[PDB]
Amino acid sequence: EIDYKDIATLKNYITESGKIVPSRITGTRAKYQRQLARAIKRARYLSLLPYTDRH
Amino acid sequence: RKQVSDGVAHIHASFNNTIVTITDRQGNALGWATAGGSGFRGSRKSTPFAAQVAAERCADAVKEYGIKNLEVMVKGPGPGRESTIRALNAAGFRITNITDVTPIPHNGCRPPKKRRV
Amino acid sequence: PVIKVRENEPFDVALRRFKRSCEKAGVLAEVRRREFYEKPTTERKRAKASAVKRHA
Amino acid sequence: PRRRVIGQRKILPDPKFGSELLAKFVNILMVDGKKSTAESIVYSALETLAQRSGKSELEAFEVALENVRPTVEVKSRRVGGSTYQVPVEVRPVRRNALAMRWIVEAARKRGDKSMALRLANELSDAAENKGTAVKKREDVHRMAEANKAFA
RNA sequence: AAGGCGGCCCCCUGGACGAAGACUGACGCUCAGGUGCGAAAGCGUGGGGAGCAAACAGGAUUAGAUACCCUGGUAGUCCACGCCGUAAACGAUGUCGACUUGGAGGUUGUGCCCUUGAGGCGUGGCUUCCGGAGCUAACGCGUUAAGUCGACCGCCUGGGGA
Ligand SMILES: [Mg+2]
Ligand SMILES: [Mg+2]
Ligand SMILES: [Mg+2]
Ligand SMILES: [Mg+2]
Ligand SMILES: [Mg+2]
Ligand SMILES: [Mg+2]
Ligand SMILES: [Mg+2]
Ligand SMILES: [Mg+2]
């Protein structure tokens, strides 16, 4: 269900500086943590999300 | 001699020293002072107090342009991260924004070996 | 950790915010971690040890 | 003082004015348990200060003491192999004691002919906030404001 | 399988596991010799070379300081194709199979339930921490055994010498 194109949902799982929030804080299942990080990584490459607060 | 009224305080705070640089929005250096060159060496150089007078001495070699607002750019882990910022604000300066810009590699270069002291 | 002071907020409060943003962000910890090379075997060793201590 | 906290002996007041404060002063000036000769020097100095400097003997004392009274100071401390200097905010009772003590010490380290004249001129100087004793307060503050970062 | 494998994307490819039923019909387990794989350093040829850094030089420390610390820095660390065949190559625990009380978790399949909630009841694979009997010199191990048994292999026979 998770898609890198759904930047709205993806935003809930990154920090102010675009860093991925660990499963601990979010309390997200471990299978999907991975799915999320792969979609956040995909979304970063396509410039639909920042890598860093810098830019 | 010229006019700015809108600047940015870049403070480089390493463990051994803390360099303060005042600049415009463009990134052009307006004035600078360091702790190591404000009468502090070795064990005293690397103190928050030395960073403070650095910030103070720097505010005197810049008000030639009459800055009135600025942002702060904190780089590095040493003392004078914070105490430097304070001195600026007391020297007659409105602080607009504070930002840490300490660089973090995404694990690139291999750092030097651990020191076996 | 970027911070922007709001109106009629003292320079101090904004600062305290900033320092807690970095406490939150892990800057100095991060810089400490990278000042010196750590062998892979060593960081695997660190990782087990903290797993272990994280049993009460 | 590892375990046992204590109160403090609450000395009798100055015999002449009935001031506990001046009793803290004569004692501080006292040497070799010569109380009789200590208060003699304190009064003659107060009498010299009182007579020819606008009177108000107790008040004259305070004007001078007001000036050498220190609001903050530093307490040495040894943490991680380092001797840090921590500036501590100091309590009122001792504030008087340091104030009195530096006035007395600056008086003996003086050129004048007797301790009474010295004491008198130290108070006068302190009253105008100048001299050694005031300067002792200022070094305390310069030393304190410097390590303001570690409070 | 072990060595070991971590940004993202594609292509080629190995193994593991689950559900259901069909097929083959003991085709299985183990394995001296044999063959293949096998961290790092090291070797050969040609590339590459930011950072790190054996050697080496310089600055310090020290009674000395061929070190620890500092400023530099070559091989090397990187790529291709060959070589080497070793490590505390470790779980210091060979492989395969059967059997023997429990508790809390992690991970990953799958059947069921007003899916009516981020759940409720089962059933496989792997895994972490405790612990029962039993075992053990003790430490500890304890259904992932170091327990109870069987099949086959490797190895030990006081220290130094080696
Ligand atoms: Mg048949
Ligand atoms: Mg080579
Ligand atoms: Mg070196
Ligand atoms: Mg060579
Ligand atoms: Mg061997
Ligand atoms: Mg156990
Ligand atoms: Mg037992
Ligand atoms: Mg033998």
Coordinates of C-alpha atoms (C1' of nucleotides) and ligand atoms in Angstrom, one line a residue:
Chain A
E1 CA 0.0 0.0 0.0
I2 CA 2.9 2.4 0.7
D3 CA 4.1 4.4 -2.2
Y4 CA 6.9 6.9 -2.4
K5 CA 4.5 9.2 -4.3
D6 CA 2.3 9.8 -1.2
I7 CA 4.6 12.5 0.2
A8 CA 1.8 13.5 2.5
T9 CA 2.0 10.2 4.5
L10 CA 5.8 10.0 4.1
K11 CA 6.2 13.4 5.9
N12 CA 4.7 12.1 9.2
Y13 CA 7.8 9.8 9.4
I14 CA 10.7 12.2 8.8
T15 CA 12.2 14.9 11.1
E16 CA 12.4 18.6 10.6
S17 CA 15.7 17.9 8.8
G18 CA 14.3 15.2 6.6
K19 CA 15.9 12.4 8.6
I20 CA 13.9 9.1 8.9
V21 CA 12.2 8.6 12.2
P22 CA 13.1 5.3 13.9
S23 CA 10.4 2.6 14.5
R24 CA 10.8 3.2 18.2
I25 CA 9.4 6.8 18.2
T26 CA 6.7 6.1 15.6
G27 CA 5.7 2.7 16.9
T28 CA 5.4 1.4 13.3
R29 CA 5.6 -2.4 12.6
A30 CA 9.0 -3.6 11.6
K31 CA 8.0 -4.9 8.2
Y32 CA 6.6 -1.6 7.1
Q33 CA 9.4 0.5 8.7
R34 CA 11.5 -1.0 5.9
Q35 CA 8.8 -0.4 3.3
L36 CA 8.7 3.3 4.4
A37 CA 12.4 3.9 4.4
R38 CA 12.5 2.5 0.8
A39 CA 9.8 4.8 -0.2
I40 CA 11.3 7.8 1.5
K41 CA 14.6 6.9 -0.1
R42 CA 12.9 6.6 -3.5
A43 CA 11.1 9.9 -2.9
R44 CA 14.4 11.6 -2.0
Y45 CA 16.1 10.6 -5.3
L46 CA 13.1 12.0 -7.2
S47 CA 13.4 15.2 -5.2
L48 CA 9.8 14.8 -3.9
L49 CA 11.5 15.0 -0.5
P50 CA 14.7 16.7 0.8
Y51 CA 17.7 14.8 2.0
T52 CA 18.6 17.5 4.4
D53 CA 17.3 20.8 5.9
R54 CA 20.2 22.5 4.2
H55 CA 18.6 22.7 0.8
Chain B
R1 CA 32.0 53.7 5.2
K2 CA 29.1 51.5 3.9
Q3 CA 25.7 50.3 5.2
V4 CA 24.3 46.8 5.9
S5 CA 21.8 46.7 8.9
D6 CA 21.1 43.0 8.1
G7 CA 23.8 40.3 8.7
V8 CA 24.7 36.8 9.8
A9 CA 27.0 35.6 12.5
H10 CA 28.9 32.4 11.4
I11 CA 30.7 30.9 14.4
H12 CA 33.2 28.1 13.9
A13 CA 33.5 26.3 17.2
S14 CA 36.1 23.6 17.2
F15 CA 37.5 21.9 20.3
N16 CA 40.8 23.8 20.2
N17 CA 39.4 27.2 19.2
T18 CA 36.4 29.2 18.1
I19 CA 36.4 31.6 15.1
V20 CA 33.7 34.2 14.8
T21 CA 32.9 35.8 11.5
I22 CA 30.2 38.4 10.7
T23 CA 28.9 38.7 7.2
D24 CA 26.1 39.9 5.0
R25 CA 23.3 37.7 3.5
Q26 CA 25.5 37.2 0.4
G27 CA 28.2 35.5 2.5
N28 CA 30.7 38.4 2.1
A29 CA 32.9 38.8 5.2
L30 CA 32.2 42.0 7.1
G31 CA 34.3 41.4 10.1
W32 CA 36.1 38.7 12.1
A33 CA 37.8 37.9 15.4
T34 CA 39.1 34.6 17.0
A35 CA 39.6 33.4 20.5
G36 CA 43.2 32.4 19.9
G37 CA 44.0 35.9 18.8
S38 CA 42.2 37.8 21.5
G39 CA 44.9 37.1 24.1
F40 CA 44.1 33.4 24.9
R41 CA 46.4 30.4 24.3
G42 CA 46.2 26.7 24.9
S43 CA 44.3 25.8 28.0
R44 CA 42.5 29.2 28.1
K45 CA 42.0 29.5 24.3
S46 CA 39.6 26.6 24.4
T47 CA 37.1 28.1 26.8
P48 CA 33.7 29.6 26.5
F49 CA 35.0 32.9 28.0
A50 CA 37.6 33.2 25.3
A51 CA 34.8 32.7 22.7
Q52 CA 32.8 35.4 24.4
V53 CA 35.4 38.1 24.0
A54 CA 35.9 36.9 20.5
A55 CA 32.2 37.7 19.9
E56 CA 32.7 41.0 21.6
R57 CA 35.8 42.0 19.7
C58 CA 34.1 41.1 16.5
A59 CA 31.1 43.3 17.2
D60 CA 33.6 46.3 17.4
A61 CA 35.2 45.6 14.0
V62 CA 31.7 45.5 12.2
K63 CA 29.6 48.3 13.6
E64 CA 31.3 50.5 11.1
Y65 CA 28.5 49.3 8.8
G66 CA 25.9 49.6 11.5
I67 CA 24.4 46.1 11.5
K68 CA 21.1 45.9 13.5
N69 CA 19.7 42.4 12.8
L70 CA 21.4 39.1 12.3
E71 CA 21.1 35.3 12.1
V72 CA 23.5 32.9 13.8
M73 CA 25.2 29.9 12.2
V74 CA 26.6 27.5 14.8
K75 CA 29.2 25.1 13.4
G76 CA 31.2 22.5 15.5
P77 CA 31.1 21.0 18.9
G78 CA 33.5 23.0 21.1
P79 CA 32.8 25.7 23.8
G80 CA 31.7 29.0 22.4
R81 CA 28.9 27.3 20.5
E82 CA 26.6 29.0 22.9
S83 CA 28.5 31.6 24.9
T84 CA 29.6 33.3 21.7
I85 CA 26.0 33.8 20.8
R86 CA 25.2 35.3 24.1
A87 CA 27.9 38.0 23.9
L88 CA 26.6 39.0 20.5
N89 CA 23.1 39.6 21.9
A90 CA 24.4 41.7 24.8
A91 CA 26.7 43.7 22.5
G92 CA 23.5 45.3 21.1
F93 CA 22.2 42.8 18.5
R94 CA 18.8 41.5 17.6
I95 CA 18.9 37.7 17.0
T96 CA 16.5 36.7 14.2
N97 CA 17.4 33.0 13.7
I98 CA 19.6 30.4 15.2
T99 CA 20.7 27.4 13.1
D100 CA 23.2 24.6 13.6
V101 CA 25.1 23.9 10.4
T102 CA 27.6 21.4 11.8
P103 CA 28.5 19.2 8.8
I104 CA 27.5 15.5 9.0
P105 CA 29.0 13.2 6.3
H106 CA 26.6 10.3 5.2
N107 CA 29.6 8.2 6.2
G108 CA 32.2 9.2 3.5
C109 CA 35.8 9.7 4.6
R110 CA 37.6 7.5 7.1
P111 CA 38.6 9.6 10.1
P112 CA 42.0 9.5 11.9
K113 CA 42.8 6.8 14.4
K114 CA 41.8 6.9 18.0
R115 CA 44.4 8.6 20.2
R116 CA 45.9 6.2 22.7
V117 CA 46.8 8.7 25.4
Chain C
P1 CA 17.9 22.2 14.0
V2 CA 16.9 25.5 12.5
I3 CA 15.2 28.1 14.7
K4 CA 13.4 31.3 14.2
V5 CA 12.6 33.7 17.1
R6 CA 9.0 34.8 17.4
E7 CA 7.9 38.3 18.4
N8 CA 8.4 39.5 22.0
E9 CA 10.1 36.2 22.8
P10 CA 13.3 36.9 24.8
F11 CA 16.7 36.0 23.2
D12 CA 17.1 33.5 26.1
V13 CA 14.0 31.5 25.5
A14 CA 14.8 31.2 21.8
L15 CA 18.3 30.0 22.7
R16 CA 17.0 27.4 25.2
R17 CA 14.8 26.2 22.4
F18 CA 17.8 26.0 20.1
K19 CA 19.9 24.1 22.5
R20 CA 17.1 21.6 23.1
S21 CA 16.6 21.3 19.3
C22 CA 20.3 20.1 19.1
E23 CA 19.8 17.9 22.2
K24 CA 16.9 16.5 20.2
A25 CA 18.8 16.3 17.0
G26 CA 22.0 14.7 18.4
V27 CA 24.6 17.0 16.9
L28 CA 27.3 16.9 19.5
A29 CA 26.8 13.2 20.1
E30 CA 27.1 12.7 16.3
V31 CA 30.3 14.8 16.1
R32 CA 31.8 12.9 19.0
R33 CA 31.0 9.6 17.3
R34 CA 32.9 10.6 14.2
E35 CA 36.0 12.5 15.5
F36 CA 37.9 9.1 15.4
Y37 CA 37.8 5.9 13.4
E38 CA 36.0 3.0 15.1
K39 CA 36.7 -0.6 13.8
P40 CA 33.6 -2.5 12.6
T41 CA 34.3 -5.2 15.2
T42 CA 34.3 -2.5 17.9
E43 CA 30.9 -1.0 16.9
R44 CA 29.4 -4.5 16.8
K45 CA 30.9 -4.9 20.3
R46 CA 29.3 -1.6 21.4
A47 CA 26.0 -2.7 19.9
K48 CA 25.7 -6.0 21.8
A49 CA 26.8 -4.3 25.1
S50 CA 24.0 -1.7 24.9
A51 CA 21.4 -4.3 23.9
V52 CA 22.5 -6.2 27.1
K53 CA 22.3 -3.1 29.4
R54 CA 18.9 -2.4 27.9
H55 CA 17.5 -5.2 30.0
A56 CA 16.4 -4.1 33.5
Chain D
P1 CA 31.1 19.3 58.0
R2 CA 30.9 15.9 56.2
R3 CA 27.8 14.9 58.1
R4 CA 27.3 17.3 61.0
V5 CA 25.6 20.5 59.9
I6 CA 25.5 23.3 62.5
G7 CA 24.0 26.6 63.6
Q8 CA 26.2 29.5 64.4
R9 CA 27.2 31.1 67.7
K10 CA 25.2 34.3 68.0
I11 CA 27.7 36.6 69.6
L12 CA 26.7 39.4 72.0
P13 CA 26.1 42.9 70.5
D14 CA 28.6 45.7 70.5
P15 CA 28.7 47.1 74.0
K16 CA 28.5 50.8 73.0
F17 CA 25.8 50.7 70.2
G18 CA 24.2 47.3 71.0
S19 CA 25.1 46.1 67.4
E20 CA 25.7 42.5 66.7
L21 CA 27.2 43.7 63.4
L22 CA 29.9 45.7 65.1
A23 CA 30.6 42.8 67.4
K24 CA 31.4 40.8 64.2
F25 CA 33.6 43.7 63.3
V26 CA 35.6 44.1 66.6
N27 CA 36.2 40.4 66.7
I28 CA 37.4 40.4 63.1
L29 CA 39.8 43.2 63.9
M30 CA 40.7 41.6 67.3
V31 CA 44.0 39.9 67.6
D32 CA 45.4 37.7 70.4
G33 CA 42.1 37.8 72.3
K34 CA 42.7 41.5 73.0
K35 CA 39.1 42.4 73.0
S36 CA 39.6 45.4 75.3
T37 CA 42.1 46.9 72.9
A38 CA 40.2 45.9 69.8
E39 CA 37.0 47.8 70.4
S40 CA 39.1 50.7 71.5
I41 CA 40.6 50.9 68.0
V42 CA 37.2 50.3 66.3
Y43 CA 35.5 53.2 68.2
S44 CA 38.3 55.7 67.8
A45 CA 38.2 55.0 64.1
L46 CA 34.4 55.3 64.1
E47 CA 34.8 58.4 66.3
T48 CA 37.3 59.8 63.8
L49 CA 35.0 58.9 61.0
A50 CA 31.9 60.1 62.8
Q51 CA 33.1 63.4 64.1
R52 CA 34.6 64.9 61.0
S53 CA 32.6 63.3 58.2
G54 CA 28.9 64.1 58.7
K55 CA 28.1 61.9 61.7
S56 CA 25.5 59.1 61.7
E57 CA 28.0 56.6 63.1
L58 CA 26.0 53.3 62.3
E59 CA 25.0 54.7 59.0
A60 CA 28.5 55.9 58.1
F61 CA 29.5 52.3 58.8
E62 CA 26.9 51.0 56.4
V63 CA 27.7 53.5 53.6
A64 CA 31.2 52.1 53.6
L65 CA 30.1 48.5 54.0
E66 CA 27.5 48.9 51.3
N67 CA 30.3 49.4 48.9
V68 CA 32.6 46.5 49.7
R69 CA 29.7 44.0 49.9
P70 CA 30.0 41.4 47.2
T71 CA 26.9 40.0 45.4
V72 CA 28.6 37.0 43.7
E73 CA 31.9 35.1 43.9
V74 CA 33.7 32.0 42.6
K75 CA 34.1 28.6 44.2
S76 CA 37.0 26.4 42.9
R77 CA 36.0 22.9 41.7
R78 CA 37.8 19.9 40.2
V79 CA 35.8 17.7 37.8
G80 CA 37.2 15.6 35.0
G81 CA 40.9 16.3 35.7
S82 CA 40.0 20.0 35.3
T83 CA 40.0 22.7 37.9
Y84 CA 36.8 24.6 36.8
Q85 CA 35.8 28.0 38.4
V86 CA 32.1 28.0 39.3
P87 CA 30.6 31.4 40.1
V88 CA 28.3 31.1 43.1
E89 CA 25.8 33.6 44.3
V90 CA 26.8 34.3 47.9
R91 CA 24.4 34.6 51.0
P92 CA 23.7 37.8 52.9
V93 CA 25.3 37.0 56.3
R94 CA 28.7 36.2 54.8
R95 CA 28.3 39.1 52.4
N96 CA 28.8 41.3 55.4
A97 CA 31.6 39.2 56.8
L98 CA 33.7 39.5 53.6
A99 CA 32.9 43.2 53.4
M100 CA 34.1 43.7 57.0
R101 CA 37.1 41.4 56.6
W102 CA 38.5 43.1 53.5
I103 CA 38.1 46.5 55.2
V104 CA 40.1 45.3 58.2
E105 CA 42.8 43.7 56.1
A106 CA 43.2 46.7 53.8
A107 CA 43.6 48.9 56.9
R108 CA 46.6 47.0 58.3
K109 CA 48.1 47.0 54.8
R110 CA 48.2 50.8 55.0
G111 CA 50.8 53.5 55.6
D112 CA 49.1 55.7 58.2
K113 CA 50.3 56.0 61.8
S114 CA 47.9 53.8 63.8
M115 CA 45.3 51.2 63.2
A116 CA 42.5 53.6 64.2
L117 CA 43.6 56.2 61.6
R118 CA 44.1 53.5 59.1
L119 CA 40.7 51.9 59.9
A120 CA 39.1 55.3 59.7
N121 CA 40.6 56.1 56.3
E122 CA 39.7 52.7 55.0
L123 CA 36.1 53.2 55.9
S124 CA 36.2 56.7 54.3
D125 CA 37.7 55.3 51.2
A126 CA 35.2 52.5 51.1
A127 CA 32.4 55.0 51.8
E128 CA 33.4 56.8 48.6
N129 CA 33.8 53.3 47.1
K130 CA 37.5 53.6 46.4
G131 CA 40.7 52.1 47.9
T132 CA 41.9 48.5 48.3
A133 CA 38.8 46.9 49.9
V134 CA 36.4 48.1 47.2
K135 CA 39.0 46.8 44.6
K136 CA 38.8 43.5 46.3
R137 CA 35.1 43.4 45.5
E138 CA 35.7 44.3 41.9
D139 CA 38.3 41.5 41.3
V140 CA 35.8 39.1 42.8
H141 CA 33.3 40.3 40.2
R142 CA 35.7 40.4 37.2
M143 CA 36.7 36.9 38.2
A144 CA 33.0 36.0 38.5
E145 CA 31.6 37.5 35.3
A146 CA 34.4 35.8 33.5
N147 CA 33.2 32.3 34.4
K148 CA 29.6 33.4 33.9
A149 CA 29.3 30.5 31.4
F150 CA 29.6 27.8 34.0
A151 CA 26.8 29.0 36.4
Chain E
rA1 C1' 27.9 -23.5 4.3
rA2 C1' 31.7 -20.8 6.4
rG3 C1' 34.5 -16.4 5.1
rG4 C1' 31.3 -12.7 5.3
rC5 C1' 27.0 -9.3 2.9
rG6 C1' 24.1 -2.4 4.3
rG7 C1' 22.5 4.4 -0.2
rC8 C1' 18.9 3.9 -4.6
rC9 C1' 17.5 1.5 -9.5
rC10 C1' 17.6 -2.3 -13.2
rC11 C1' 19.4 -7.0 -15.3
rC12 C1' 21.4 -12.3 -14.5
rU13 C1' 21.3 -15.9 -10.5
rG14 C1' 21.6 -19.4 -5.6
rG15 C1' 19.2 -20.8 -1.1
rA16 C1' 15.2 -20.7 2.7
rC17 C1' 10.0 -20.8 4.2
rG18 C1' 4.3 -21.3 3.9
rA19 C1' -0.4 -23.2 1.7
rA20 C1' -2.8 -27.0 -1.0
rG21 C1' -2.9 -31.2 -3.4
rA22 C1' -0.6 -34.5 -7.4
rC23 C1' 3.9 -37.3 -8.9
rU24 C1' 8.6 -40.5 -8.1
rG25 C1' 9.0 -44.7 -4.7
rA26 C1' 14.2 -45.5 0.4
rC27 C1' 16.3 -42.4 -4.8
rG28 C1' 18.6 -41.7 2.4
rC29 C1' 22.6 -40.1 6.4
rU30 C1' 27.9 -39.8 6.9
rC31 C1' 32.5 -39.3 4.4
rA32 C1' 39.3 -41.1 4.7
rG33 C1' 41.4 -39.7 0.0
rG34 C1' 39.7 -35.9 -4.0
rU35 C1' 37.5 -31.1 -5.5
rG36 C1' 35.7 -26.2 -4.6
rC37 C1' 35.0 -21.9 -1.4
rG38 C1' 37.7 -19.1 2.1
rA39 C1' 38.6 -12.0 6.5
rA40 C1' 42.8 -9.1 6.7
rA41 C1' 47.7 -8.5 5.6
rG42 C1' 51.0 -10.0 1.7
rC43 C1' 52.7 -11.0 -3.9
rG44 C1' 52.7 -10.1 -9.8
rU45 C1' 51.1 -6.8 -14.2
rG46 C1' 48.4 -2.4 -15.5
rG47 C1' 45.1 1.2 -13.8
rG48 C1' 43.4 4.5 -9.7
rG49 C1' 44.6 7.6 -5.4
rA50 C1' 40.2 12.1 -1.8
rG51 C1' 40.6 10.3 3.4
rC52 C1' 43.3 6.9 6.4
rA53 C1' 48.2 5.0 7.2
rA54 C1' 52.9 0.1 8.1
rA55 C1' 57.9 2.2 6.5
rC56 C1' 60.3 6.8 6.7
rA57 C1' 61.3 12.2 8.0
rG58 C1' 60.6 16.2 11.4
rG59 C1' 58.5 18.2 16.3
rA60 C1' 57.7 16.7 21.5
rU61 C1' 57.7 13.5 26.1
rU62 C1' 61.4 10.8 28.9
rA63 C1' 66.9 9.0 32.8
rG64 C1' 66.6 6.8 27.8
rA65 C1' 61.8 6.8 24.1
rU66 C1' 64.1 3.2 17.7
rA67 C1' 57.2 4.2 21.3
rC68 C1' 52.6 6.0 23.2
rC69 C1' 51.1 12.3 21.5
rC70 C1' 51.8 16.2 17.2
rU71 C1' 53.1 17.9 11.8
rG72 C1' 54.0 15.3 7.3
rG73 C1' 53.9 10.9 4.6
rU74 C1' 55.3 5.8 0.8
rA75 C1' 53.6 1.0 0.2
rG76 C1' 48.8 -0.4 1.3
rU77 C1' 43.7 0.5 1.8
rC78 C1' 40.2 1.2 -4.2
rC79 C1' 39.4 -1.4 -9.8
rA80 C1' 40.6 -5.6 -13.4
rC81 C1' 42.9 -10.3 -14.1
rG82 C1' 46.0 -13.9 -11.5
rC83 C1' 48.5 -15.7 -6.8
rC84 C1' 48.4 -16.8 -1.5
rG85 C1' 45.0 -20.6 1.6
rU86 C1' 46.0 -18.3 6.9
rA87 C1' 43.0 -15.7 11.9
rA88 C1' 40.6 -15.9 19.1
rA89 C1' 38.6 -18.6 10.5
rC90 C1' 34.8 -18.8 17.8
rG91 C1' 29.1 -20.8 19.8
rA92 C1' 36.8 -21.9 21.3
rU93 C1' 30.5 -26.5 20.9
rG94 C1' 31.4 -31.6 13.5
rU95 C1' 27.0 -33.4 10.5
rC96 C1' 22.2 -36.0 10.3
rG97 C1' 17.9 -38.0 12.6
rA98 C1' 14.3 -39.4 17.0
rC99 C1' 12.8 -38.3 21.9
rU100 C1' 12.1 -35.3 26.8
rU101 C1' 8.2 -30.0 31.7
rG102 C1' 7.7 -24.1 31.2
rG103 C1' 7.6 -18.2 31.0
rA104 C1' 8.5 -13.6 28.4
rG105 C1' 9.9 -11.3 23.8
rG106 C1' 12.0 -10.2 18.5
rU107 C1' 11.4 -11.8 13.2
rU108 C1' 8.9 -14.0 9.0
rG109 C1' 4.7 -17.4 6.4
rU110 C1' -0.4 -19.0 6.8
rG111 C1' -6.2 -20.9 8.4
rC112 C1' -10.3 -18.9 11.2
rC113 C1' -13.5 -14.3 13.7
rC114 C1' -19.8 -8.8 13.9
rU115 C1' -11.9 -7.5 9.1
rU116 C1' -16.6 -3.4 12.2
rG117 C1' -10.4 -0.9 16.7
rA118 C1' -4.1 -0.2 15.9
rG119 C1' -7.4 -6.9 17.7
rG120 C1' -9.8 -12.2 19.2
rC121 C1' -8.4 -18.1 18.5
rG122 C1' -5.1 -21.4 16.1
rU123 C1' -0.6 -23.3 12.9
rG124 C1' 4.6 -23.5 10.5
rG125 C1' 10.2 -21.5 9.7
rC126 C1' 14.2 -18.6 12.3
rU127 C1' 15.8 -15.9 16.7
rU128 C1' 16.9 -13.4 21.9
rC129 C1' 16.6 -13.5 27.3
rC130 C1' 15.3 -16.5 31.7
rG131 C1' 14.5 -21.3 33.7
rG132 C1' 12.6 -27.1 35.0
rA133 C1' 14.3 -32.2 35.2
rG134 C1' 18.8 -34.1 33.7
rC135 C1' 23.8 -33.2 32.8
rU136 C1' 28.5 -30.8 34.6
rA137 C1' 34.9 -30.3 38.1
rA138 C1' 32.6 -26.0 38.7
rC139 C1' 31.2 -22.0 35.5
rG140 C1' 27.3 -23.1 33.3
rC141 C1' 24.0 -25.9 29.3
rG142 C1' 18.9 -26.6 29.5
rU143 C1' 13.6 -28.6 23.1
rU144 C1' 18.6 -23.7 18.8
rA145 C1' 21.3 -29.3 24.9
rA146 C1' 26.5 -29.3 27.2
rG147 C1' 19.7 -33.7 28.5
rU148 C1' 18.0 -39.0 26.7
rC149 C1' 19.6 -42.2 22.2
rG150 C1' 21.4 -43.9 17.3
rA151 C1' 24.7 -43.4 12.3
rC152 C1' 29.2 -41.8 10.2
rC153 C1' 33.6 -38.5 10.2
rG154 C1' 37.7 -35.4 12.5
rC155 C1' 40.8 -35.1 16.7
rC156 C1' 43.3 -35.8 22.1
rU157 C1' 46.8 -39.0 25.4
rG158 C1' 51.7 -34.4 31.0
rG159 C1' 54.6 -29.3 30.4
rG160 C1' 58.6 -27.3 27.7
rG161 C1' 61.2 -28.9 23.0
rA162 C1' 57.3 -27.9 18.5
Ligands
MG1 MG 3.2 -46.5 -6.9
MG2 MG 48.7 -5.1 -5.6
MG3 MG 51.0 9.7 12.6
MG4 MG 55.3 -3.8 -3.5
MG5 MG 44.6 -23.3 12.4
MG6 MG 19.5 -20.8 30.7
MG7 MG 19.6 -26.9 37.8
MG8 MG 55.6 -34.2 26.2

